[PDB]
Design a protein around this ligand. Structure first.
Ligand SMILES: [Zn+2]
Ligand SMILES: [Zn+2]
Ligand SMILES: [Zn+2]
Ligand SMILES: [Zn+2]
Lengths: 75, 146, 63, 63
């Protein structure tokens, strides 16, 4: 189980595999919040989370909270 | 806008995002100061970065104007502290709140965009030798960001 | 303050939240889950509240 | 966290219940009041939450 703070500031609870991939998580979030994974950006420790990677890769322990904001581009 | 801005401050007062803080400077509810702590395991670690935030009258239909007061070394942010980031102009959404804007900005610190740079001169360093770009970013943090 | 009815479970199956919006013209009634609203439409039933024809059923996400 | 969300006022103006439903395809986001949501449509802005084009604003009741 992990927690996500949604764009509007609500907290949702997710059941996740330690080896789960960010791309999947976004998919889960799409099921709950109805947001396209292409419009999601997950932030942890102030750093973004790359789709290809996995919760394991990013060291996400149980109960750790992730922050959702909208996709963005620097320019 | 005030009712919206007040709500944003109240949630910031109580439960602020991991590293960020914001709130009005003095009297004017439409002028805020914010602080962003440099992300851990980045060249900005330990740096304390101050920003100014001016909410427009039609907020949040229009974006707040956000700029760095603290000097920072980064290809998408210039020496006026101007931030060229899409959610501050075209990609703005009225559902974004300062907390989330501030979080997006931290994530920009660790994931720049050298391909379409606000500061070309820093873009080349990021692209070519990254140990250098990181070296300078670290010096600027100690010089300017402490 | 009738906004609190959105806390109650679907008024029919009662196993799911009310995320089905039953749309008629430019208005809509959100008293049932998506699956129930979709099943009402499919059966040719009208809106259970206002008995207007059901033009569209959408899954609503609160935010 | 549904209790806090469904009963909170419009995220945009914070003055009115969220009865404007922003419709796109088979889904909608219920976030804003009807007035604030119409302004978005009228100015041809996309949905604040998912960024999808807004197909229409439905004034939504929950009895
Ligand atoms: Zn049902
Ligand atoms: Zn009806
Ligand atoms: Zn409103
Ligand atoms: Zn939407």
């Amino acid at each position: 189980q992990i927690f996500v703070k949604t764009l509007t500031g609500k907290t949702i609870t997710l059941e996740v595999e330690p080896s789960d991939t960010i791309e999947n998580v976004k998919a889960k979030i799409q099921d709950k919040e109805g947001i396209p994974p292409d419009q999601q950006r997950l932030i942890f420790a102030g750093k973004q989370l790359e789709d290809g990677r996995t919760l394991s890769d990013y060291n996400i322990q149980k109960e750790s909270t992730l922050h959702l904001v909208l996709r963005l581009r620097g320019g | 806008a005030l009712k919206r801005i007040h709500k944003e401050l109240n949630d910031l007062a109580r439960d602020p995002p991991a590293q960020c803080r914001a709130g009005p400077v003095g009297d004017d509810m439409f002028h805020w100061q914010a602080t962003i702590m440099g992300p851990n395991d980045s060249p900005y670690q330990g740096g304390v970065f101050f920003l100014t935030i001016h909410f427009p009258t039609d907020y949040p239909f229009k974006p707040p104007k956000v700029a760095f007061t603290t000097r920072i070394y980064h290809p998408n942010i210039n020496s006026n502290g101007s931030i060229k980031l899409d959610i501050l102009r075209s990609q703005w959404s009225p559902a974004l709140t300062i907390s989330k804007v501030l979080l997006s900005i931290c994530s920009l610190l660790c994931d720049p965009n050298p391909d379409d740079p606000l500061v070309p001169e820093i873009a080349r360093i990021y692209k070519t030798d990254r140990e250098k770009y990181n070296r300078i970013a670290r010096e600027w943090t100690q010089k300017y960001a402490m | 303050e009738d906004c609190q009815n959105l806390l109650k479970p679907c008024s029919l199956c009662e196993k799911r939240p009310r995320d089905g919006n039953i749309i008629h013209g430019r208005t809509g009634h959100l008293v049932t889950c998506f699956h129930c609203a979709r099943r009402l439409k499919k059966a040719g039933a009208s809106c259970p509240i206002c008995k207007k024809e059901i033009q569209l059923v959408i899954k609503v996400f609160i935010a | 966290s549904l209790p806090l969300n469904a009963i909170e006022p419009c995220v945009i103006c914070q003055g009115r219940p969220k009865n404007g439903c922003i419709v796109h395809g088979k889904t909608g986001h219920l976030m804003a009041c009807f007035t604030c949501a119409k302004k978005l449509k009228k100015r041809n802005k996309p949905c604040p939450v998912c960024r999808q084009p807004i197909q229409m604003i439905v004034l939504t009741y929950f009895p």
